[PDB]
Enzyme design. Structure first.
Site, PDB file in Angstrom:
ATOM      1  N   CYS A 125       0.816  -1.216   0.000  1.00  0.00           N
ATOM      2  CA  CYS A 125       0.000   0.000   0.000  1.00  0.00           C
ATOM      3  C   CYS A 125       0.849   1.266   0.000  1.00  0.00           C
ATOM      4  CB  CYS A 125      -0.935   0.018   1.211  1.00  0.00           C
ATOM      5  SG  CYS A 125      -1.640  -1.588   1.638  1.00  0.00           S
ATOM      6  N   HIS A 142      -3.836   7.804   5.521  1.00  0.00           N
ATOM      7  CA  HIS A 142      -3.890   6.503   4.882  1.00  0.00           C
ATOM      8  C   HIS A 142      -5.329   5.995   4.939  1.00  0.00           C
ATOM      9  CE1 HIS A 142      -2.565   2.796   3.207  1.00  0.00           C
ATOM     10  NE2 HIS A 142      -2.751   2.086   4.306  1.00  0.00           N
ATOM     11  N   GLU A 150      -3.905   4.695  13.136  1.00  0.00           N
ATOM     12  CA  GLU A 150      -3.417   5.909  12.483  1.00  0.00           C
ATOM     13  C   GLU A 150      -3.753   7.144  13.316  1.00  0.00           C
ATOM     14  OE1 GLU A 150      -4.203   6.572   8.221  1.00  0.00           O
ATOM     15  OE2 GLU A 150      -2.468   7.907   8.386  1.00  0.00           O
ATOM     16  N   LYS A 157      -9.533   8.290   0.192  1.00  0.00           N
ATOM     17  CA  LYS A 157      -9.849   6.910  -0.173  1.00  0.00           C
ATOM     18  C   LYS A 157     -11.344   6.637  -0.075  1.00  0.00           C
ATOM     19  CE  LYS A 157      -5.455   4.627   0.876  1.00  0.00           C
ATOM     20  NZ  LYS A 157      -4.764   5.782   1.524  1.00  0.00           N
ATOM     21  N   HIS A 198      -9.357   2.143  -1.824  1.00  0.00           N
ATOM     22  CA  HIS A 198      -7.940   1.921  -1.606  1.00  0.00           C
ATOM     23  C   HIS A 198      -7.305   1.422  -2.900  1.00  0.00           C
ATOM     24  CE1 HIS A 198      -4.116   1.020  -0.153  1.00  0.00           C
ATOM     25  NE2 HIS A 198      -4.347  -0.070   0.556  1.00  0.00           N
ATOM     26  N   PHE A 229       0.373  -3.064   4.427  1.00  0.00           N
ATOM     27  CA  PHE A 229       0.685  -4.420   4.875  1.00  0.00           C
ATOM     28  C   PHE A 229       2.185  -4.648   4.771  1.00  0.00           C
ATOM     29  CE2 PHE A 229      -3.494  -4.437   2.776  1.00  0.00           C
ATOM     30  CZ  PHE A 229      -4.305  -4.839   3.836  1.00  0.00           C
TER      31      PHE A 229
END
Lengths: 411, 411
Positions: free
Chosen positions: A162, A301, A312, A333, A338, A397
């Site tokens: 990501c 994110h 986050e 997003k 995403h 990830f």
């Protein structure tokens, strides 16, 4: 240590087939998520994705010279062209050797593999296309883009899930900063809407099972049950200040900071307290030579996952502290979905355009709030805002954390 | 600019399951190429490969954790551990934040994809393992390595096909040099011996269909008909000089130069006259602050392909000039095969060990001297040689060129 500026942008997203469609639609809170049309989602539990709308590759590249490209490469080529046109970067015999390409793809040619594997299995290895390998591998976006543009400078791809788009831009940034290129065409690209990717990401429970489009993806909200898969490409043309001014190019913004860390915790789960994300944010600000006070905007994110979105917020609260209340956070997003590898590229664009136009895109679907996530989400509607320093987060990830800091240009 | 030194080495190769074995066996001209046992090779035209010999993953990692790792990650874990032990780098609460990982894999989890795709097809999407995604993607080697070691500094992977190992090390080098980490665990890893990879590479006519174990891989020689595939991992622990000296570590060599360029020519075919290769070699020497006169050894890319090996010699000839016929060039792929992603790491090791032991590994099978490739290739037999500066070339598919320059540690 040279100053690095953004002179061009290129984008293909679920909410627009070019930068200003994408950006304008982003300020109107448009929804890119919808029923999957690319594959038969009958045997799955996820049927929603942020697909590109009304996009024909043959409008951009000849059929023969497209059948030999996986979608992820197709998107990169189209977006890079747009960005070079936008910057009016002339790539020729005098300049090519110092103009590089650094475009990552987190997943690569998923569809290509599926097709070629079906062949080998069902019809034997002898009928596997000689174009399989150069269609499949992640660095083929970078390779094909450089061939298409004639760019010959530093040539690579940072693959970090990501965080792919953010890392790739960051590496390109440091390449110009150290003086190894005058210009870099950089960013992220991804075409994950495939049988294998949907079956893989839902097996690991990362995907939302929500069938309704108005709440499917809802960053920082009650009921958020994972991210929604999207496709596209976010490409930047970045240059040294010398170079940009010498050829007479318009400047969107400056790139001043880049931080990257590892969680060293879990292969899929965020580190508690978003500790890795915090160290990445601090590193990027230490790079830029600024403090949390100086940051007005942070493109989060925020993928609409229980732990991610929570962790986050914890990371932001730890790093910014007092300034956390006086800080605008947005998760774009919520509209695009995403985009995996491509998400960092598109968000760098959003961030730089936020500094230029003095606006911040909203976090749509901000319906059911969360007492844990108590930040300024810039809910449902775009706000005006004077920005000097913008941040963009990518916490993917594999424990990869990547943060960029952009700055308004003035001299 | 901070001085960057190599303090640790780790390796899994077709000619040894650790550095000492690999290097010793390398100085004896041992053949790593043999008949494939990994898979039934009946329907294919290629039956040879460089597989790891007498390697069981359960000797290093518990079966429950190894089952959740594709071979390419398994190799990265085992080799990184060796390099860390070798460097005696301690990763703890006080250091971890400044110790990063940057390990690339050009191909990633080929086998994992084949298994999961088969299940998706003849069983269904619900039988796909929840560990599929984190097993499949290329940055997972970096992710799993950092988790395993607790390393928390800059976290990434440079995916550039055959040049992956070399670029990854170059990035890690630049990270330490700019002072963004004290140490980096870096290199390349690859497990390409799979149905889809053999079928993919032979389809594109890049693999030898030769069965003669003793002539399959003949770099630079007359009958060469493509590369021979290999597996393994080449991992370096690199550190700032201040850091290595503070904790008291033995130094193998210093990294002083790194160049990367793009051909912008063809997706698989090298730029004519290895022009991109030349720019990369020049860039690395300009970085290092040396001229072609200063290089005694060059670990060549030399993959045993008609166009590749010829174009590399051309690049070398064009760049070195008069010094070309006084340069000791050698292609260690003659023994290990072409390890793709891992090859850049394995060769950085060979290059550094060549400076320390003042010994150059040979190019075995140098039976039939091709009149076009007239370089000092250190034929069949390892030579002694005092080296001050060593070069390592990686010029792979996608038009990626990467070159590192190593230097004997001064003071």
């Amino acid at each position: 240590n040279k100053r690095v500026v953004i002179t061009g942008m290129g984008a293909l997203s679920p909410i627009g087939n070019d930068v200003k469609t994408t950006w304008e639609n982003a300020l109107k809170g448009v929804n890119g998520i919808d029923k999957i049309t690319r594959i038969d989602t009958e045997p799955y539990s996820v049927h929603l994705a942020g697909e590109l709308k009304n996009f024909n590759i043959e409008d951009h590249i000849d059929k023969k010279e497209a059948r030999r490209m996986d979608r992820f490469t197709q998107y990169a080529i189209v977006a890079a062209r747009e960005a070079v046109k936008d910057a009016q970067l002339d790539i020729n015999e005098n300049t090519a050797d110092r103009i590089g390409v650094w475009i990552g793809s987190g997943i690569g040619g998923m569809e290509t593999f599926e097709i070629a594997h079906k062949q080998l299995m069902d019809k034997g290895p002898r009928r596997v296309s000689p174009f399989f390998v150069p269609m499949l591998i992640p660095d083929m976006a970078t390779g094909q883009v450089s061939i298409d543009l004639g760019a010959k400078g530093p040539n690579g791809a940072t693959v970090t899930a990501c965080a792919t788009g953010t890392n790739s831009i960051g590496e390109a940034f440091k390449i110009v900063q150290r003086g190894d290129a005058d210009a870099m065409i950089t960013g992220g690209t991804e075409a994950p809407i495939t049988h294998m990717a949907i079956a893989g990401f839902s097996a690991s429970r990362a995907l939302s099972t929500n069938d309704d489009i108005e709440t499917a993806c809802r960053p920082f909200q009650e009921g958020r049950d994972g991210f929604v898969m999207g496709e596209g490409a976010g490409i930047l043309v970045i240059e040294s200040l010398e170079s940009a001014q010498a050829r007479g190019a318009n400047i969107y913004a400056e790139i001043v900071g880049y931080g990257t860390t590892g969680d060293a915790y879990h292969i899929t789960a965020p580190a508690p307290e978003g500790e890795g994300g915090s160290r990445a944010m601090q590193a990027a600000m230490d790079d830029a030579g600024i403090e949390p006070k100086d940051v007005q905007y942070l493109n989060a994110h925020g993928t609409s996952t229980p732990v991610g979105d929570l962790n986050e917020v914890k990371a932001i609260k730890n790093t910014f502290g007092e300034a956390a209340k006086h800080l605008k956070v947005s998760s774009t997003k919520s509209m695009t979905g995403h985009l995996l590898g491509a998400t960092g590229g598109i968000e760098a664009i959003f961030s730089a355009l936020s500094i230029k136009d003095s606006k911040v895109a909203p976090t749509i679907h901000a319906v059911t709030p969360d007492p844990e996530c108590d930040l300024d989400i810039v809910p449902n509607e775009a706000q005006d805002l004077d920005i000097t320093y913008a941040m963009s987060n990518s916490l993917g990830f594999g424990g990869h954390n990547a943060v960029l800091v952009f700055k308004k240009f003035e001299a």
